[PDB]
Point group: C3
Chain length 313, copies 3
């Protein structure tokens, strides 16, 4: 089949930015600050089922491509941009584990047995152990020659793994992942300021919002480090809507689907903050960012399921 | 008038380093550690009135230059060194707001109504949103080609705004400004170590002392992060008196007036520290740095008001 | 004597990595987590006496070389690699002060009179004030042209001095040294990621483990910053055994003696952690790293005292 050679690894962004929506809707349904919203816990279940189906689809499709044409993911893995998209097949699974619907989780049973944390973070941790080792000892694939805004996709995995580790109960593994995540977020942040794409340049917002969420999941509250990182993420989000006013052009692509993952985590951190600092301005900010990320995911969805059908119908 | 084209933006340093003295004298008059000093609260009022008069003078003079010869501040704004001096016309106003004399503040009235924070930090926050956005997406004005010791003047604004926000009561805006200030202080600090002027090379001390003061104003006490930043500032101050022994030469200029702003904030942070850790060695250190910054401001003043009169008398 | 001109400054690593073993054995004998180990406090005393004898030997030998052939340590000091080994003659003394045997310390007497902190950290602090000043104002010896993995030897001194300052009682000097240590560890860490030796490339582990130990000595417990730095050090240790599997080759040298100092501090931080978080996996990790660093020091020792005798016997 000649279709599989044209199947990209960036198609996992469609599932990343769609399973990160199940988490946001679960938060909006369970947060005791957005309780004026008469939101149902059924929306989270529907979005999560859609995300899991999409993940299974683009995972079996990619397993077929990897087992049939192995020279193709080798050309896709030795790229400066498309090597960081090999973390999304595991971040998209950690985002399904974190946002498991309450109606679907076993009642009066095991609270997310930690096997789902290991089985999902080990393939990310090994790839990260290789990439972070190449960032030093690499000759041609050193960080100073590869550093791009899509390099934040290697770091986000650590904070999402910390959230999942906090969920499963292993708090110390969460602290380990958060430490090795911030230690390299500092490096990437400083190395990207020395050295304009619309969708993928916005990964500057997904790493600090995730670092704020992971610290609030590990340690119970939003204790000034979650706040430091969240306010850094909010400034990076505010300084991004200003350059690209939102009128970049008629562009709706699979790469544009990784324009929703940073906005959704930045809308989730602010929901946690609005339930941590219950003002009116903070609640309105969380309600604005949430309805701004959700509507973009919705339009991308009704656009994709349109192009998909009007291909040859 | 041909005088206005030769009027520099760096003349706002004369007001920055003179309104930062009203704050130091207010601290020396109100700190319950320097109470052996029989200092009067009238010195703070006199210095603050002088600073406000100087600010009004060099602000009306600069408004006239900007509204008459607009091609001049365009040549002054597109400079690597003189673009960071566009933050001082607002930091010098925040330093008047923070150090309002107790005798002049309305008794039994509003405690610094937060309009003075917005009206004074908005023009700084917009310019900062533009500069920090250019540090990434700029072609010729990127940070790696502009980074100089005077680039710390973009960061100090955040910490001074955090102090003012803590004063007006909006603590969360203070935390926001402190977060977006430290996030870029790390970048500037690391980018200035890769790549010797006497007065302006000393901006390495004004940013950490201000970051220590802002954290102590936001959170009530001097809780180990104020201490980390203050000790970093003290080491940078100690490692500066050693290179330039203080005998750089017979040099007393308007650029030398931005040699007092870093020393004054580093003398203010140590007053806060001496009232936080009440030893003898700490009190003597605060009393040494205070009398070392104040005497330099005094000699610069009696030198400037001398050249000013002996021009043509 | 023609032998002295061939005497290297890196010979102080033999004492650094051997006096850092007295501390590890004292910890293993005094930690209330490794109490299943029937370890004796006599092993710490024996190792400390050996370390002090070696230090006196290679210090008198080097004083003779410095006072006889002064043109040689000038050629050794103006090197990019061998200028950072001028901190080890003081870190090796701070490691004797920190790990003084309990049987040898005066009972019911002064608790490490702080003169041993000043007399041992002043020669390090002056050299550090010079090197850190050159990292900015240097023309040919700037950091961007000198930064190598052995540059972490300038930073470790700060954290070891913080531990010693906490021991002697001067906690605020410890906080000062920790602040000026982390401020430059961030710089070195970020500047080494832009720009493979076996023994000296492993200094990436000695600085964060020491920064974790210093924060736990200053502030009583292992409070999440010690944990952040220790987990960063543990990841850097885990990502180092993987590249060099431990089979680099038949190499046992004086430079290989500075392959034990990072592993020993990383085995000491994990002993502190295992006494802070008393699980089984953490205790086994501390017992693994300890018996992995100690056996390497032991084999290096029985190898050195073999080559030394079989030279000409
Ligand atoms: C083993 C080689 C790797 C070394 C790094 C280990 C991480 C820190 C060790 C501390 C041990 C400890 O004591 O804590 C770790 C915890 C047990 O503690 P807890 O139940 O969470 O504490 C109590 C908190 N309650 C009360 C809330 C429950 O179990 C673990 O998560 C095991 C970690 C598995 C490996 C994690 C490494 C990360 C890479 C993932 C590879 C699959
Ligand atoms: C709005 C778009 C900008 C997004 C960034 C907002 C900052 C954080 C929001 C948290 C809201 C909150 O809940 O706190 C913010 C506080 C209200 O809380 P508080 O009274 O201080 O808490 C109680 C503490 N007491 C008990 C001590 C009093 O009000 C504000 O300062 C409004 C902030 C105005 C905008 C600040 C943005 C900075 C740029 C300046 C532009 C003029
Ligand atoms: C002097 C020019 C250098 C400026 C930097 C000074 C460091 C911070 C000053 C705070 C003073 C203070 O108040 O604390 C410092 C302490 C006294 O406090 P403490 O007993 O530990 O607190 C009580 C804690 N207990 C209750 C547990 C005991 O004494 C000192 O360690 C003096 C420091 C000597 C110089 C340190 C500079 C580092 C370079 C080393 C050069 C030899
Ligand atoms: C780039 C190398 C250094 C990387 C690390 C930089 C920052 C490390 C510490 C940041 C996170 C620690 C925040 C402190 C939290 C408090 O101590 C409380 N214990 C929170 O529980
Ligand atoms: C350059 C990218 C990362 C920038 C951020 C680096 C450091 C971020 C945290 C430093 C400040 C947090 C200090 C922690 C304070 C404690 O948690 C207490 N809650 C203080 O109230
Ligand atoms: C490179 C320039 C910036 C360097 C500093 C970066 C991090 C500075 C703060 C890290 C250490 C502070 C951790 C905070 C501890 C808590 O506030 C508690 N008070 C601990 O006692």
């Amino acid at each position: 089949w000649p279709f599989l050679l044209r199947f990209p690894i960036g198609c996992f962004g469609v599932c990343l930015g769609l399973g990160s929506q199940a988490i946001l809707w679960g938060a909006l349904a369970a947060s005791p600050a957005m309780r004026f919203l008469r939101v149902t816990p059924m929306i989270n279940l529907a979005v999560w089922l859609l995300a899991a189906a999409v993940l299974a689809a683009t995972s079996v499709t990619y397993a077929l491509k990897c087992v049939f044409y192995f020279e193709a993911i080798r050309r896709e893995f030795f790229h400066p941009v498309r090597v960081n998209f090999f973390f999304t097949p595991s971040i998209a699974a950690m985002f399904l584990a974190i946002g498991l619907p309450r109606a679907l989780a076993p009642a009066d049973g095991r609270a997310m047995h930690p096997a789902v944390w290991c089985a999902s973070v080990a393939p990310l941790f090994a790839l990260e152990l290789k990439i972070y080792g190449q960032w030093l000892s690499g000759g041609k694939r050193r960080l100073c020659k590869v550093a791009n805004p899509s390099s934040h996709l290697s770091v986000v995995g650590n904070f999402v793994g910390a959230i999942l580790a906090a969920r499963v109960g292993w708090v110390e593994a969460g602290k380990f992942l958060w430490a090795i995540g911030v230690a390299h977020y500092i490096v990437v942040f400083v190395t990207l300021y020395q050295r304009e794409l619309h969708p993928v340049y916005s990964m500057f917002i997904a790493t600090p919002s995730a670092a704020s969420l992971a610290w609030a999941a590990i340690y119970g509250s939003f204790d000034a480090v979650a706040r430091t990182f969240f306010f850094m993420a909010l400034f990076l989000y505010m300084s991004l809507v200003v350059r690209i006013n939102f009128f970049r052009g008629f562009r709706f692509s699979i790469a544009w689907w990784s324009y929703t993952f940073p906005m959704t985590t930045a809308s989730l951190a602010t929901v946690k903050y609005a339930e941590a600092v219950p003002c009116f301005l903070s609640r309105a900010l969380a309600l604005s960012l949430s309805l701004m990320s959700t509507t973009m995911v919705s339009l991308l969805l009704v656009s994709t399921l349109l192009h998909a059908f009007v291909w040859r119908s």
